[PDB]
Design a protein around this ligand. Structure first.
Ligand code: HEM
Length: 376
């Protein structure tokens, strides 16, 4: 199982299933990590911050204070910055946020109307919508789209540095570049928007800046890839949009689309205290990679796991994580995807495949390089 093999990148889910069917907790000796593909096992590890952690300092690893961030802190320190970010999130009026998200999606869809040739929905919709959406929420001017994607691409590829260590350095350079952008916004941001509210709430300055950088990039990188993957499914299966289109029906549809096309394929933890996971005893110091995308296809929990089923129980999928580190933006992301579905229906356009979906060579975060379609 080479996670970056071209055949795996083309469609990793049959490989996930082969792993899950043989052992829900495999030891990957070359990555020196457990590979967890079972739903119960991923859900266990994600919620148990007592025995499994994200702060490597809890296994005696030196981490400078300048590099601490919400995603690499565990309780009790995690609660302060986490609460700060949630407070700033909850100060944003949702009527304004939904109007902004709906306008952005509609504007970029209308720009596709009348395109006689082939259009790439990744670069023409998923990425610009995600970038304007996150910066609108943050209350800051959008950076150059092509330039920002170059930085983000380097960062996303660096998440696979455990597989290809050469990917680390381009990511460090892109991270430092996003740091300067966040520093400018902190000094200059309007009182309106998430940045202004975070600043007021504030926690050491380095934790705040690093956490805002995570909000920015986690938002852009995840939303753009979620939209790309959802769009790829909709173009092949337009019947998914021909449903009741009520608020409750769309709630179920959106939940399934996130379960199936949630872009996070791998979510890592370190074992702080020995604990059984699946059939295995995991040991303090062991790294675990939770294949949460694979867990979301576990047939024990999601019968007909590769299909949209509109009658499943809500609150099951792990695409937003679970527990203390559950996605800060899960509500924003679901709201945003809901508005995209509404914009597609109101646009009336017919998007037909004009070539194969092509995927980037990224294993931790799954993303399309291109989604060629015909606007109609
Ligand atoms: C506006 C959109 C988004 C924002 C602002 C955002 C931001 C964040 C932040 C700051 C965290 C860290 C929370 C913490 O460590 O306490 C996080 C976690 C996470 N996000 Fe999001 N995110 C967004 C969208 C998404 C989407 C669309 C997905 C996948 C469908 C996703 C998947 C995840 C997951 C799985 C985690 C958990 C990581 C872990 O277990 O440590 N996010 N997000």
């Amino acid at each position: 199982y080479d996670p970056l093999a071209p055949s795996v990148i083309a469609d990793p889910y049959p490989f996930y299933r082969k792993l899950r069917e043989t052992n829900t907790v495999h030891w990957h000796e070359f990555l020196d990590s457990w590979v967890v593909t079972g739903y119960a096992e991923c859900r266990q590890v994600l919620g148990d911050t007592t025995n499994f952690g994200s702060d490597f300092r809890r296994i005696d690893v030196e981490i400078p204070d300048t590099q601490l961030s919400v995603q690499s802190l565990d309780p009790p320190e995690h609660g302060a910055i986490r609460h700060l970010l949630v407070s700033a999130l909850h100060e944003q009026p949702l009527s304004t946020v939904r109007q902004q998200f709906a306008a952005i999606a509609a504007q970029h869809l209308a720009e596709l109307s009348g395109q006689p040739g082939t259009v790439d929905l990744v670069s023409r919709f998923a990425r610009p919508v995600a970038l304007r959406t996150i910066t609108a929420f943050l209350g800051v001017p959008p950076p150059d789209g092509a330039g920002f994607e170059q930085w983000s691409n380097a960062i996303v590829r660096s998440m696979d540095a455990g597989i290809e260590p050469a990917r680390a350095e381009p990511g460090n350079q892109a991270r430092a570049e996003l740091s300067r952008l966040v520093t400018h916004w902190l000094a200059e941001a309007d009182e309106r928007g998430f940045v202004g509210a975070a600043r007021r709430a504030a926690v050491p300055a380095a934790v705040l800046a690093n956490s805002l950088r995570a909000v920015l990039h986690a938002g852009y990188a995840s939303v753009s890839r979620l939209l790309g993957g959802v769009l790829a499914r909709l173009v092949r299966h337009p019947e998914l949009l021909a449903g009741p289109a009520t608020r409750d029906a769309d709630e179920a549809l959106v939940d399934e689309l996130i379960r199936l096309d949630g872009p996070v394929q791998a979510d890592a933890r370190v074992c702080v205290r020995d604990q059984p996971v699946g059939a295995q005893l995991v040991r303090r110091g062991d790294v675990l990679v939770l294949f949460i995308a694979a867990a979301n296809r576990d047939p024990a929990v999601f019968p007909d796991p590769d299909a949209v089923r509109l009658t499943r129980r809500r609150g099951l999928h792990l695409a937003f994580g679970r527990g203390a580190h559950a996605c800060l933006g899960a509500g924003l992301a679901t709201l945003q995807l809901r508005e995209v579905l509404g914009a597609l229906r109101a646009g009336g356009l017919r998007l037909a495949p004009a070539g194969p979906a092509a995927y980037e060579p990224t294993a931790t975060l799954r993303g399309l390089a291109e989604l060629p379609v015909s606007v109609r």
